[PDB]
Amino acid sequence: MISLIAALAVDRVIGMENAMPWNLPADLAWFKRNTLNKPVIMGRHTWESIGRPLPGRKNIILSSQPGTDDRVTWVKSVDEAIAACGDVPEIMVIGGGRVYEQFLPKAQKLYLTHIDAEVEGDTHFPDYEPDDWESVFSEFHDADAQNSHSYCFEILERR
Ligand SMILES: NC(=O)c1ccc[n+]([C@@H]2O[C@H](COP(=O)([O-])OP(=O)(O)OC[C@H]3O[C@@H](n4cnc5c(N)ncnc54)[C@H](OP(=O)(O)O)[C@@H]3O)[C@@H](O)[C@H]2O)c1
Ligand SMILES: Nc1nc(=O)c2nc(CNc3ccc(C(=O)N[C@@H](CCC(=O)O)C(=O)O)cc3)cnc2[nH]1
Ligand SMILES: [Mn+2]
Ligand SMILES: [Mn+2]
Ligand SMILES: [Mn+2]
């Protein structure tokens, strides 16, 4: 099973200048809980944005050019990325925009955080047909001293 996980601001913005400008510790905690002990697939730009391997996860990087760091696994195509994960129950695709576009048609589950924040971005989550997805979990949270925006955790499963 392939799943995508992402945090979306207003208008499906996911990034600006290869960064995420907001800071929501509760969402990063949700990301860690849902990805720990699973393989994570990311594109090269997202690898450079994170800046280090994510501990406790098999890190697989998509790039057309040779890898430059043997602490992670480098692959050259979508099919190779999936194969490098082996026989696991759930593969997590962690972005960015171009990678999400390629894996969306193959995904059975979306873990989405909807952040009530307006930011001027250059990267968006793919348009996804709402009729194809059933919401099986949603949990709203108001802003607090640690999290400066309200946010909604949602899990969607392909119908
Ligand atoms: N809010 C969120 O949830 C979230 C999550 C992830 C990322 N982001 C943000 O998203 C932005 C990065 O997204 P992005 O769309 O620019 O880039 P990306 O999807 O991270 O990376 C694209 C790169 O991945 C490689 N790639 C992708 N598909 C490939 C394929 N089929 N075969 C081989 N290589 C492939 C290419 O690398 P080469 O050029 O080396 O071939 C391509 O240039 C940043 O702003 C980041 O902060 C946000
Ligand atoms: N829900 C969600 N939120 C995000 O912010 C997110 N970000 C990315 C891409 N960017 C990043 C940037 C940093 C870390 C990171 O350092 N995560 C730590 C959290 C611990 C911490 O730094 O507070 C990790 O161990 O996973 C992960 C992804 C991909 N999927 C996401 N999914
Ligand atoms: Mn091929
Ligand atoms: Mn197999
Ligand atoms: Mn806000």
Q: Where are the domains of the chain?
A: 1-159
Point out the ligand 2 atom lying closest to the alpha carbon of residue 52. 16
Q: CA torsion sign, 101 to 97 to 120 to 35?
A: positive
Amino acid in the structure at residue 27: D
Separation of CA 83 from chain center: 19
| Three-state SS at 64 | coil
Q: Give resolution in angstroms.
A: 1.2
Over its C-alpha atoms, the chain yields an Rg (Å, rounded) of: 15
Contact in structure between 80 and 131 (CB atoms under 8 Å): no
Instruction: Give the 3-state DSSP-derived string for 74-135, with helices as H, strands as E and coil as C.
Output: EECCHHHHHHHCCCCCCEEECCCHHHHHHHHHHCCEEEEEEECCCCCCCEECCCCCHHHEEE
Q: Distance between CA atoms of 149 and 51, rounded to whole angstroms? A: 25
Q: Rounded distance, CA 113 to CA 140, Å?
A: 10
97 CB near ligand 2 (under 6 Å) = no
Q: How far apart are CA 120 and CA 13, in angstroms?
A: 8
117 C-alpha vs ligand 1 centroid, how far in Å?
22
Task: List phi, psi (to 5°) of 115.
Answer: -100, 130
- Name residue 59's amino acid: N
For residues 60 and 80, give the distance between their C-alpha atoms in angstroms, rounded to a whole number. Answer: 10
Q: Compute the C-alpha angle 136/104/20, nearest 5°.
A: 85
Residue ranges in 25-87 assigned as alpha helix (H):
25-35, 44-50, 78-84
Tokens of 70: 């043997």
- The DSSP 8-state label assigned to residue 3 in this structure reads E
* For ligand 1, atom 22: residue with the closest CA: 43
- In which residue are the tokens 């924040």 written? 117
Residues in CB range of 134: below 8 A, 6 or more apart = 156, 157, 158, 159
8-state DSSP, 24: -
Are residues 126 and 19 in contact, defined by beta-carbon separation less than 8 angstroms? Answer: no
Establish how many alpha carbons lie within 13 A of residue 146's alpha carbon, considering only the half-sphere containing its beta carbon: 7
Binding residues for NADP(+): 7, 13-19, 45-46, 63-64, 76, 95-102
Q: Are 42 and 96 a contacting pair, CB within 8 Å?
A: yes
CB 128 within 8 A of CB 24: no
